Amino acid sequence: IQRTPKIQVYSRHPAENGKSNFLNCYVSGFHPSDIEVDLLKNGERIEKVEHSDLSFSKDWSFYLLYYTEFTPTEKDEYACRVNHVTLSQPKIVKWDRDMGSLVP
C-alpha cells in the first residue's frame, strides 16, 4: 500500500524583507521512501537545498525536512514542489506569508 506525502511549508522567523531567514518544507506520511522535493523561488529551483536524514514514524510512514537559508524581498514568492509515485504530477505548495497592508 502506498501513502501520499503531506507537505507543509514554513519559515523559521517572521518574514522581514532583506533579513536572512530559513525556508522549510516538511514532507511526511509517505510510502515508499523515494521522493523528489525542490524548493522554488519565483517558480525556479533553488540550488543546494539541505535535508534531514530520512526517518519514519511509528506507523512506518517516512518523513524528511528540506530547508535553505534565504533572504526574501517584497517581489519574491517561494514554494515547495514534491513528486512521489502517488502523484500524477508534482504538487506545489506555496509559502504563505503576509505582504502587510495592501491599499495605501
Binding site: Q8, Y10, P14, S33, D53, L54, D96, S101
Partner: protein, 274 residues
C-alpha cells in the same frame, strides 16, 4: 524515551539496493551510518558516550557483517518469501532504562515480524510469509542470543554513558518567538487568523487564541514541525467573522518563559486600523 536505532533497506531490484541506518536518543538523532566507509558517524561529541575507541570498531564490524548477511539473505529467500521487487524493509530496535526493549521489522510499510525475548515472532496479520521469514531469522539460536544481548545488555549500557553525558542537551531551554499572519483559506465573510510559534525547545508548548482571559475554543493547533536547528514550530489558527477579530490575541506558554507568556495582538495593519 531512551535509545533506538532505525534501519531503512530499499530493495529496488535484485541487483540494486540502498541502506540507511541512524541512532536516536529520545527524539534526537545521535548517530548515522556511512555505508560507503562502513563507519558509525557521531553527530554530537557526546554521542560516543564513555565507550572506548576500540569498542566502537567491534560494533562497526558486527553492524557491517550483519548488514551484508542481511541483504544477501533477503535476496536469497526473496522468492521463497514472495518478496516482489521493489520492496522496502524497515527495522526499529532499542531500549529504555530505569525499563524495556523492542525490535520490530516491517515489510512494505506494515508490521511484519518482531523479536520477543529470544526469538523472532510473526505478527498474526502478516500471514504465512511472516512465519516463513521467522524460520530464516531463527535459523541460528546463537545469533538470536546476540540480538537479545544487544537489546537487554548493550543498549541500556549505552544510555548509561549517554543520557548523563548529554542530558545537558535534552534539558536545555530555548525560548520561542511568535508572530501573526492572515490565513489563506477563510470561508466567505470570515477570516483565518494564524499564530506562528517558532524556535522553542523542549517540545511541550501551549498556544491559544484568546479574547482577554477567555480561551477561544475554535483554536486549531497544527502538528509540531521540526526546524533545521533542532527547535520546533507550530501554527495555531482561528476562524472568525470579519470585524469580530477585534480584541483577539495569541498567547504562548512554554517552560523556558518562566511564566512570562508571549502575548501578541491582532492589531495594526493586520486589522487594518485607520
Amino acid at each position: 524515551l531512551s535509545f533506538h536505532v532505525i534501519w531503512i533497506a530499499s530493495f529496488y531490484n535484485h541487483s540494486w539496493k540502498q541502506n540507511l541506518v541512524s541512532g536516536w536518543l529520545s527524539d534526537l538523532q545521535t548517530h548515522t551510518w556511512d555505508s560507503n566507509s562502513s563507519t558509525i558517524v557521531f553527530l554530537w561529541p557526546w554521542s560516543r558516550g564513555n565507550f572506548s575507541n576500540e569498542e566502537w570498531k567491534e560494533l562497526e564490524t558486527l553492524f557491517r557483517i550483519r548488514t551484508i548477511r542481511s541483504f544477501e539473505g533477503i535476496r536469497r529467500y526473496a522468492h521463497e518469501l514472495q518478496f516482489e521487487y521493489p520492496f522496502e524493509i524497515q527495522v526499529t530496535g532499542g531500549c529504555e532504562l530505569h525499563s524495556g526493549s523492542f525490535l520490530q521489522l516491517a515489510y512494505q510499510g506494515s508490521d511484519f515480524v518482531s523479536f520477543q525475548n529470544n526469538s523472532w515472532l510473526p505478527y498474526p496479520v502478516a500471514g504465512n510469509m511472516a512465519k516463513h521469514f521467522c524460520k530464516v531469522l531463527n535459523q541460528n539460536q546463537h545469533e538470536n542470543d546476540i540480538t537479545h544481548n544487544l537489546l537487554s545488555d548493550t543498549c541500556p549500557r549505552f544510555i548509561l554513558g549517554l543520557l548523563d553525558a548529554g542530558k545537558a542537551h535534552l534539558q536545555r531551554q530555548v525560548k520561542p518567538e511568535a508572530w501573526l499572519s492572515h490565513g489563506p483559506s477563510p470561508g466567505p465573510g470570515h477570516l483565518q487568523l494564524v499564530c506562528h510559534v517558532s524556535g522553542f525547545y523542549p517540545k511541550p508548548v501551549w498556544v491559544m487564541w484568546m479574547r482577554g482571559e477567555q480561551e477561544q475554543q475554535g483554536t486549531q493547533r497544527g502538528d509540531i514541525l521540526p526546524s533545521a536547528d533542532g527547535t520546533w514550530y507550530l501554527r495555531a489558527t482561528l476562524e472568525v467573522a470579519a470585524g469580530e477579530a477585534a480584541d483577539l490575541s495569541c498567547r504562548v506558554k512554554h517552560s523556558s518563559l518562566e511564566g512570562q507568556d508571549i502575548v501578541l495582538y491582532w492589531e495594526g495593519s493586520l486589522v487594518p486600523r485607520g
